[PDB]
Write an enzyme that holds these catalytic residues in place. Structure first.
Site, short mmCIF file in Angstrom:
data_model
loop_
_atom_site.label_atom_id
_atom_site.label_comp_id
_atom_site.label_asym_id
_atom_site.label_seq_id
_atom_site.Cartn_x
_atom_site.Cartn_y
_atom_site.Cartn_z
N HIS A 2 -6.40 7.16 -3.02
CA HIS A 2 -7.33 6.27 -2.32
C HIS A 2 -6.68 5.46 -1.21
O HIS A 2 -7.41 4.80 -0.47
CB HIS A 2 -8.04 5.34 -3.28
CG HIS A 2 -7.23 4.14 -3.64
ND1 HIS A 2 -6.21 4.20 -4.57
CD2 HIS A 2 -7.27 2.87 -3.19
CE1 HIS A 2 -5.66 3.00 -4.68
NE2 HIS A 2 -6.30 2.17 -3.88
N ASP A 3 -5.35 5.48 -1.06
CA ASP A 3 -4.69 4.80 0.06
C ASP A 3 -3.71 5.72 0.76
O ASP A 3 -2.80 5.24 1.46
CB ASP A 3 -3.96 3.52 -0.39
CG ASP A 3 -4.90 2.32 -0.52
OD1 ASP A 3 -4.69 1.54 -1.46
OD2 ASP A 3 -5.81 2.16 0.32
N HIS A 15 0.82 -1.22 0.00
CA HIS A 15 0.00 0.00 0.00
C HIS A 15 0.86 1.28 0.00
O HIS A 15 0.83 2.10 0.92
CB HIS A 15 -0.96 -0.03 1.18
CG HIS A 15 -2.11 -0.97 0.99
ND1 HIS A 15 -2.24 -2.16 1.68
CD2 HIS A 15 -3.20 -0.89 0.18
CE1 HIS A 15 -3.34 -2.77 1.30
NE2 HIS A 15 -3.95 -2.02 0.40
C1 7OY Z 1 -4.59 -6.73 -6.29
C2 7OY Z 1 -4.69 -7.60 -5.07
C3 7OY Z 1 -5.26 -6.98 -3.85
C4 7OY Z 1 -5.35 -7.78 -2.77
C5 7OY Z 1 -5.88 -7.35 -1.44
C6 7OY Z 1 -7.21 -7.95 -0.99
N1 7OY Z 1 -7.63 -7.48 0.32
C7 7OY Z 1 -8.15 -8.28 1.31
O1 7OY Z 1 -8.62 -7.87 2.35
C8 7OY Z 1 -8.15 -9.73 1.10
C9 7OY Z 1 -9.38 -10.33 1.23
C10 7OY Z 1 -9.47 -11.69 1.06
C11 7OY Z 1 -8.33 -12.40 0.79
F1 7OY Z 1 -8.40 -13.73 0.62
C12 7OY Z 1 -7.11 -11.79 0.67
CL1 7OY Z 1 -5.76 -12.82 0.32
C13 7OY Z 1 -6.99 -10.42 0.82
C14 7OY Z 1 -7.44 -6.09 0.66
C15 7OY Z 1 -6.06 -5.59 0.33
F2 7OY Z 1 -5.13 -6.15 1.16
F3 7OY Z 1 -6.03 -4.25 0.57
C16 7OY Z 1 -5.69 -5.89 -1.11
N2 7OY Z 1 -4.92 -9.07 -2.88
N3 7OY Z 1 -4.91 -10.02 -1.94
C17 7OY Z 1 -4.39 -11.07 -2.57
N4 7OY Z 1 -4.06 -10.83 -3.87
C18 7OY Z 1 -4.40 -9.57 -4.04
N5 7OY Z 1 -4.28 -8.82 -5.15
MG MG Z 2 -7.41 0.82 0.40
ZN ZN Z 3 -5.71 0.45 -2.91
#
Ligand code: 7OY
Ligand code: MG
Ligand code: ZN
Length: 342
Positions: free
Chosen positions: A121-122, A81
């Site tokens: 956004h972050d 992030h």
């Molecule tokens: C582009 C991209 C972005 C995210 C995450 C998804 N997010 C979660 O909460 C999450 C929810 C359920 C899950 F099973 C997992 Cl693994 C994470 C929020 C975040 F971390 F901000 C970004 N991931 N995650 C794994 N490959 C990703 N690729």
């Molecule tokens: Mg975010």
């Molecule tokens: Zn983001």
């Protein structure tokens, strides 16, 4: 001062043409993480110019240079992030504009708000999720925990603080109503980056995709804005396998650092944030199938020129299942030792 001379060049040298960034810059196959970070504030200016937002909205070029640099420096450096996430989320938004004919679905101002929202956004992400803010009784939780979407409210408020820093309000010439409209859009769009919000509205996005998008339906505009923003936010998964493998490493590096902090506070982390329980292929396949793939299938249902994106996400999902065996240690570790058993 470092931002000083970076601002001076970004203002007085001129805006590089988008094609002079990369000859496939506007293509869905481009990986904007390939761009050196030192080149990204200029790329931001190039895209804003290429979408005509600078001219159409008469943005002050001194103000906009200061804005883009303030936004870049408003990001910290956690594994995922960070400013290169926000830059590549912004780049996908540009791609949607260059490839999906957004002007038949959205007003000019909403398309402008999406892009600006993507850059913002972050802002000031600390590498931890919303649950951790509450669990750790952080200052952000003390501000926003009763409203929910703690970090995303903090992101929005950071974007406003940048706008309220003298010399940085790219909107401060807008009509009173257009200004209120843009900040209202930015609130709605950043807050949609909370996946808990995406997951809440998924049936409505489904319902909107089934009856078909009504250009005259104000709630369709909002829904579509939230889906596009989520599509920008997860857009790392629409590129080649290697991108997604690197991105998975960045995410799990970030999560596991948070899980380590939670254990140092006496809390059992989420399986996905605990490096002693997280089975990465399992989780990635779960995230791709349950979250990532359905978002792009909805994107595909609304824009058929977006099929290639979903087909990319599905390909990457299936490569996780293929490489899943590789997480099982066959034979001995490459150092020939079983000391790691002790
Ligand atoms: C582009 C991209 C972005 C995210 C995450 C998804 N997010 C979660 O909460 C999450 C929810 C359920 C899950 F099973 C997992 Cl693994 C994470 C929020 C975040 F971390 F901000 C970004 N991931 N995650 C794994 N490959 C990703 N690729
Ligand atoms: Mg975010
Ligand atoms: Zn983001």
């Amino acid at each position: 001062s470092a931002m000083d001379d970076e601002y001076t060049k970004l203002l007085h040298d001129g805006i590089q043409p988008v094609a002079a960034i990369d000859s496939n810059f506007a293509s869905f196959t481009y990986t904007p993480r390939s761009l050196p970070e030192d080149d990204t504030s200029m790329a931001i200016l190039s895209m804003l110019q290429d979408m005509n937002f600078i001219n159409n909205y008469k943005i002050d070029c001194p103000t906009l240079a200061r804005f883009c640099l303030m936004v870049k420096k408003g990001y910290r450096d956690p594994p995922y992030h960070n400013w290169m996430h926000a830059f590549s989320v912004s780049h996908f938004c540009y791609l949607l504009y260059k490839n999906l004919e957004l002007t038949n679905y959205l007003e000019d101002i909403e398309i402008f708000a999406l892009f600006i929202s993507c850059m913002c956004h972050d802002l000031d992400h600390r590498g931890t999720n919303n649950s951790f803010q509450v669990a750790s009784k952080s200052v952000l939780a003390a501000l926003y925990s009763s409203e929910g979407s703690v970090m995303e409210r903090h992101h929005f408020a950071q974007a406003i603080a940048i706008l309220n820093t003298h010399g940085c309000n790219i909107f401060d010439h807008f009509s009173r109503k257009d200004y209120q409209r843009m900040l209202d859009l930015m609130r709605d769009i950043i807050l949609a980056t909370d996946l808990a919000h995406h997951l809440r509205i998924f049936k409505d996005l489904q319902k909107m995709a089934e009856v078909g998008y009504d250009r005259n339906n104000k709630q369709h505009h909002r829904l579509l804005l939230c889906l596009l923003m989520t599509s920008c936010d997860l857009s790392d998964q629409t590129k080649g396998w290697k991108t997604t493998r690197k991105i998975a490493e960045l995410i799990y590096k970030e999560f596991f650092s948070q899980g380590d902090l939670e254990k140092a506070m006496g809390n059992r982390p989420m399986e996905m944030m605990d490096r002693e329980k997280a089975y990465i292929p399992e989780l990635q396949i779960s995230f791709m199938e349950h979250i990532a793939m359905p978002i792009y299938k909805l994107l595909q249902d609304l824009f058929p020129k977006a099929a290639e994106l979903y087909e990319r996400v599905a390909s990457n999902r299936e490569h996780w299942t293929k490489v899943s065996h590789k997480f099982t240690i066959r034979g001995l570790p490459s150092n020939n030792s079983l000391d790691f058993l002790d």
